[PDB]
Design an enzyme around this catalytic site. Structure first.
Site, PDB file in Angstrom:
ATOM      1  N   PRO A 102      40.076  43.532  47.177  1.00 16.81           N
ATOM      2  CA  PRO A 102      38.781  43.205  47.742  1.00 16.81           C
ATOM      3  C   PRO A 102      38.269  41.906  47.087  1.00 16.81           C
ATOM      4  O   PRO A 102      37.888  41.890  45.907  1.00 16.81           O
ATOM      5  CB  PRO A 102      37.953  44.449  47.488  1.00 16.81           C
ATOM      6  CG  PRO A 102      38.577  45.054  46.278  1.00 16.81           C
ATOM      7  CD  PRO A 102      40.035  44.720  46.358  1.00 16.81           C
ATOM      8  N   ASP A 116      39.254  39.391  42.086  1.00 12.32           N
ATOM      9  CA  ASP A 116      39.533  40.757  42.441  1.00 12.32           C
ATOM     10  C   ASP A 116      38.342  41.549  41.989  1.00 12.32           C
ATOM     11  O   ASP A 116      38.240  41.948  40.831  1.00 12.32           O
ATOM     12  CB  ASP A 116      40.721  41.256  41.717  1.00 12.32           C
ATOM     13  CG  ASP A 116      41.162  42.655  42.133  1.00 12.32           C
ATOM     14  OD1 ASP A 116      40.388  43.461  42.651  1.00 12.32           O
ATOM     15  OD2 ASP A 116      42.328  42.959  41.937  1.00 12.32           O
ATOM     16  N   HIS A 117      37.521  41.935  42.954  1.00  9.73           N
ATOM     17  CA  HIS A 117      36.276  42.579  42.620  1.00  9.73           C
ATOM     18  C   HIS A 117      36.452  43.988  42.036  1.00  9.73           C
ATOM     19  O   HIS A 117      35.508  44.547  41.489  1.00  9.73           O
ATOM     20  CB  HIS A 117      35.415  42.606  43.877  1.00  9.73           C
ATOM     21  CG  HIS A 117      33.934  42.835  43.567  1.00  9.73           C
ATOM     22  ND1 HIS A 117      33.335  43.119  42.412  1.00  9.73           N
ATOM     23  CD2 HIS A 117      32.929  42.774  44.488  1.00  9.73           C
ATOM     24  CE1 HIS A 117      32.052  43.222  42.589  1.00  9.73           C
ATOM     25  NE2 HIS A 117      31.808  43.018  43.838  1.00  9.73           N
ATOM     26  N   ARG A 118      37.611  44.644  42.083  1.00 10.23           N
ATOM     27  CA  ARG A 118      37.792  45.927  41.431  1.00 10.23           C
ATOM     28  C   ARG A 118      37.713  45.818  39.916  1.00 10.23           C
ATOM     29  O   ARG A 118      37.266  46.703  39.194  1.00 10.23           O
ATOM     30  CB  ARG A 118      39.149  46.489  41.802  1.00 10.23           C
ATOM     31  CG  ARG A 118      39.335  46.730  43.298  1.00 10.23           C
ATOM     32  CD  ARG A 118      40.764  47.100  43.610  1.00 10.23           C
ATOM     33  NE  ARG A 118      41.672  46.036  43.256  1.00 10.23           N
ATOM     34  CZ  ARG A 118      42.978  46.200  43.375  1.00 10.23           C
ATOM     35  NH1 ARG A 118      43.483  47.352  43.834  1.00 10.23           N
ATOM     36  NH2 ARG A 118      43.809  45.231  42.984  1.00 10.23           N
TER      37      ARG A 118
END
Ligand SMILES: CC(C)(COP(=O)(O)OP(=O)(O)OC[C@H]1O[C@@H](n2cnc3c(N)ncnc32)[C@H](O)[C@@H]1OP(=O)(O)O)[C@@H](O)C(=O)NCCC(=O)NCCS
Ligand SMILES: CC(C)(COP(=O)(O)OP(=O)(O)OC[C@H]1O[C@@H](n2cnc3c(N)ncnc32)[C@H](O)[C@@H]1OP(=O)(O)O)[C@@H](O)C(=O)NCCC(=O)NCCS
Ligand SMILES: CC(C)(COP(=O)(O)OP(=O)(O)OC[C@H]1O[C@@H](n2cnc3c(N)ncnc32)[C@H](O)[C@@H]1OP(=O)(O)O)[C@@H](O)C(=O)NCCC(=O)NCCS
Ligand SMILES: NC(=O)CCCC[C@@H](S)CCS
Ligand SMILES: NC(=O)CCCC[C@@H](S)CCS
Ligand SMILES: NC(=O)CCCC[C@@H](S)CCS
EC number: 2.3.1.12
Lengths: 243, 243, 243
Positions: free
Chosen positions: B39, B215-217
């Site tokens: 994401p 990488d927004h995680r």
């Protein structure tokens, strides 16, 4: 892909269900299919359209005498058509083997018309062959038929590239979604007067915002920065199409 | 994921099939695998490089005497290396359990070279330990080998972070795709002269555009706005790396 | 979706494993679920907040006398609440049939607080009914509870829309991820002084950057450019909420 959990929305207050038109449902399915298939990048650029705009405005009488209104859409369509021939990877589609590109030798371009029933994207064929007042007239015909639900599926087929213009409403840039199986889409937002460095001082120049999203499997970052660079150069002097 | 329906493209005009190189096919598979796993968010920032640029330009003789050409890439590589140590979550990867991060204590950085056969991303090891003229020389060696198909897979391995620069071609910003399993990538676009408010009047300052996708995680919005803030601060006074 | 191949990262140097908090793991799963379900577009806009800012600053005594601090978040919350009622498609969710929208007649808005354990998004209910100092106080209460791990899941439920502000840290714009099942999220970045053309010369105007990401299945490009246009207009003269 995991689904979103359903929520009882009425637990937080009053809700009302309104249904989506079939057009919206088609629209929704296609966008989601594009989203998951296309690794998207957006390349942003600003073009100096000060002189293009003064041309547009002076040809207002010629245009009125022809019964068309010359907006910016034909000037974008013509320049993108020239470019789709200079840089052919933008005028192509990924073959279903995933191991070939199908290069198209024709330039037909669609453009987004947002209508009450949903989004339609009429296609103007052989954009490379028509002139600014021909494209002006046809664009307007097609958009009226689109708004009137009288556009036939015939005219929604086999485009090469899509222009999506929100300049008439506002905004600075956005990231459009590629209309797969096409490989790129140009978003156009609102022109503003802007200070531009001339080597000595800043000069106000009317700047148009462009947002090119592309299918990165087929187009790499440098090919795309070159496309918006060339397009900004053609819109700064459209006479270069003449040569 | 639903496939795109195949279209008989020859119904609309002449088409031609050209095939993709194996490099392109590898490229395509990796981008799509990153797209669906990561994401993505992009954080945009502008750095004031007026003085960095005047430094670059004055050291032109030193650089020529050393046989290297000092571009901006080494100055970005050095600053990003310092930062990948200050903010270690950017120098890490999501463990396959999805419940751990693997923090790397080494800084090796790749950089995108777009070659005719496709995209290659050579890696410079221990960027934190080399100097501007060492990084200048190595970057150029690696890019020539990359263009010449003489780069060995050895040099395409185990990077921590990627820099992707299109400043040499044009553009305002773009949204690069994270080269997973890395967790961030810095896109760099074209520097322009820009009016910048000094408290009293606007001063022309040479502004460099940065586009950090992450990488927004693993990285949250505030950590990323802090990374581009710090990077803009280090590029405004690179002597702060000295302290 | 294909997984990323695991890499032995220790082959390139020293590594260390640190584990993710459960909050991060929840966070990660939700973002990835949103990413794959929502075809995302981001619409960028700049609002002129010169006068809003001078209002904010003059009401500093009133605010201090009330024990609250009036930041920009309440002024954004109030304007977005007015707008979520003017343009109801932004205040709705896609029904699980995929063939209906559920329009909510309540306006509750969440806001992103990044805490050490991970991201929390507390919700302020009936934002349309509270006043700037009420929203100021509640926002701050909720953020302190969030940082203190004392926020109850009760307050993380049934939001309509999310505001994510990184203006306190830096940046120019970013592309936030929609917090599904909501249909839009406003990212706010750092205000800068900027030359703005007044018809004759450029005037310095304090410009606030807005980044609206939206679920394109439910919101089309023109509805979204209209939302950021209206929001920029309301933030330029907040008295228009009065009418
Ligand atoms: C030819 C046609 C299809 C498209 O026209 P267009 O290029 O969008 O231009 P419009 O005349 O609709 O735009 C409205 C106004 O905003 C202006 N505008 C358009 N693009 C602009 C831009 N990028 N920046 C700033 N202003 C812009 C127009 O020049 C026009 O000014 P006017 O009212 O003073 O003449 C038109 O007949 C039509 O149907 N317009 C409706 C809007 C629309 O759906 N456009 C879709 C284009 S992809
Ligand atoms: C060291 C090397 C690998 C990268 O160099 P680089 O930092 O890209 O710089 P280049 O010299 O290639 O750039 C060409 C010109 O554009 C300029 N340019 C580079 N970045 C710029 C930026 N961000 N903004 C504006 N102009 C820029 C350069 O300074 C250079 O100017 P010059 O011709 O007057 O010297 C270089 O030897 C090389 O192979 N260059 C080819 C381009 C390339 O693939 N770059 C990839 C970097 S990720
Ligand atoms: C009410 C609250 C929840 C949010 O406040 P806020 O609107 O973020 O404002 P803050 O006071 O935190 O911001 C810090 C400073 O940066 C400024 N700032 C905030 N938004 C800005 C913007 N968009 N552009 C430029 N500067 C900005 C603030 O006005 C403030 O200035 P000050 O220190 O001179 O008073 C606050 O009590 C809080 O907890 N703040 C911490 C930051 C945070 O997590 N904000 C999340 C909002 S989605
Ligand atoms: N034509 C369709 O039915 C799908 C929607 C169009 C794809 C592009 S225009 C989305 C622009 S953000
Ligand atoms: N290295 C690869 O084979 C995959 C492509 C690179 C990922 C990044 S550089 C994409 C930048 S937009
Ligand atoms: N609330 C969650 O648990 C998921 C993360 C939030 C979605 C938005 S705020 C992401 C902003 S980039």
């Amino acid at each position: 892909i995991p689904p979103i959990p359903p929520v009882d929305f009425a637990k937080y207050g009053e809700i009302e269900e309104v249904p989506m038109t079939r057009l919206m449902q088609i629209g929704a399915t296609n966008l989601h299919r594009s989203w998951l298939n296309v690794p998207h990048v957006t390349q942003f650029e600003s073009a100096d359209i000060t002189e293009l705009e003064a041309f547009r405005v002076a040809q207002k009488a010629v245009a009125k005498k022809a019964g068309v209104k010359l907006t910016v859409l034909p000037l974008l369509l013509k320049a993108c058509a020239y470019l789709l021939k200079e840089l052919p990877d933008f005028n192509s589609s990924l073959a279903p083997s995933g191991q070939a590109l199908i290069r198209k030798k024709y330039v037909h371009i669609g453009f987004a018309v947002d209508t009450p029933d949903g989004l339609l994207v009429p296609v103007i064929r052989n954009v490379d062959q028509k002139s600014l007042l021909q494209l002006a007239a046809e664009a307007a015909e097609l958009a009226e038929k689109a708004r009137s639900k009288k556009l036939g599926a015939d005219a929604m087929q086999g485009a090469c590239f899509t222009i999506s213009s929100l300049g008439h409403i506002g905004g600075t840039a956005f990231t459009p979604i590629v209309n797969a199986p096409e490989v790129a889409i140009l978003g156009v937002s609102k022109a503003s007067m802007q200070p531009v460095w001339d080597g000595k001082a800043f000069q106000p120049r009317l700047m148009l915002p462009l947002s090119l999203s592309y299918d990165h499997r087929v187009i790499n970052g440098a090919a795309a920065a070159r496309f918006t660079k060339r397009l900004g150069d053609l819109l700064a002097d459209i006479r270069a199409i003449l040569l």
